[PDB]
Amino acid sequence: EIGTGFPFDPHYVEVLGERMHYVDVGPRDGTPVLFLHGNPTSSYLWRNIIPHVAPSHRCIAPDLIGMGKSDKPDLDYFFDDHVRYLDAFIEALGLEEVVLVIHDWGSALGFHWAKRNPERVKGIACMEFIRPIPTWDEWPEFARETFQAFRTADVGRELIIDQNAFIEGALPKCVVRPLTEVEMDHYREPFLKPVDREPLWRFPNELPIAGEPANIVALVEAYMNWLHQSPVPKLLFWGTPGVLIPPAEAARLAESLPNCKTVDIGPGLHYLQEDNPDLIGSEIARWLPALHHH
Numbered sequence: 570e571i572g573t574g575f576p577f578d579p580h581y582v583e584v585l586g587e588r589m590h591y592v593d594v595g596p597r598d599g600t601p602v603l604f605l606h607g608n609p610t611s612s613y614l615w616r617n618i619i620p621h622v623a624p625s626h627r628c629i630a631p632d633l634i635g636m637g638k639s640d641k642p643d644l645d646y647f648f649d650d651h652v653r654y655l656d657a658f659i660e661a662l663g664l665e666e667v668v669l670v671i672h673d674w675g676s677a678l679g680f681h682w683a684k685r686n687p688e689r690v691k692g693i694a695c696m697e698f699i700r701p702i703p704t705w706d707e708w709p710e711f712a713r714e715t716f717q718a719f720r721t722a723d724v725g726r727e728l729i730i731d732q733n734a735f736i737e738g739a740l741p742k743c744v745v746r747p748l749t750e751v752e753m754d755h756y757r758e759p760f761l762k763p764v765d766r767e768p769l770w771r772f773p774n775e776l777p778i779a780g781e782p783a784n785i786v787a788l789v790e791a792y793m794n795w796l797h798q799s800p801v802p803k804l805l806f807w808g809t810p811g812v813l814i815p816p817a818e819a820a821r822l823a824e825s826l827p828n829c830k831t832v833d834i835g836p837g838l839h840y841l842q843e844d845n846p847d848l849i850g851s852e853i854a855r856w857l858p859a860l861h862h863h
């Protein structure tokens with residue numbers, strides 16, 4: 570079955586005046602595997618995947634600014650704020666070449682960094698990542714209303730900040746098996762005080778849906794252009810029915826993305842790590858050795 574503990578020693582690093590928490594295990598020689606969570610999650614989302622990979626490779630899984638066990642400065646938490654902190658995080662640890670394991674807003678941060686540091690990416694493992702959703706018709710029906718409501722300064726603040734609906738509502742609804750209360754409490758913990766939920770609200774207001782916001786739609790389009798023509802080894806996990814990346818779109822991507830291997834996870838929605846962590850972890854470890862050469 571799936572484990573609910575988080576048996577990792579904390580590591581902390583001062584970045585732009587703020588302390589960021591991260592996981593750090595595995596050997597210190599060789600290429601590190603850098604794990605990037607999104608909304609409303611943290612390193613806790615990678616807990617059952619990292620132990621498949623750490624036997625062979627350094628695993629670094631940071632908590633984004635405002636999230637996890639990282640500090641909570643009073644920010645708008647625009648994507649660009651996460652870009653600044655994440656960039657500084659990576660330089661602070663002296664990372665040179667990396668492999669990237671990425672999801673959701675972690676995938677926006679990770680593709681954006683790769684495009685800008687192409688020579689430092691030896692491979693990308695991705696799942697339920699962010700690319701333009703050009704019309705609301707191209708967002709999943711079952712979540713259209715919910716996300717349209719989230720994308721408002723009145724209703725959307727109400728639901729997400731005041732009633733915690735992204736943690737209590739969206740998260741569990743996008744995992745096919747039922748999250749346990751132990752798991753839910755590890756996800757609830759950073760956001761016990763409502764005022765700290767600002768990143769949970771700004772994030773769905775940053776999604777590139779229906780041309781808006783214009784800056785994110787362009788920056789995402791630019792990293793998707795880069796990806797489509799990069800020969801970097803890519804490993805894409807997908808589920809059924811999925812959310813951002815439904816089966817038919819995973820097949821299309823298998824064909825249109827260079828040097829891409831896809832893996833079918835079975836059932837899942839958005840947080841695929843919670844439904845099949847073992848296959849995700851094992852398939853990643855499997856894949857890493859052949860990335861190593863020049």
Ligand SMILES: [Cl-]
Nearest residue numbers: 608772773776
């Ligand atoms: Cl979001």
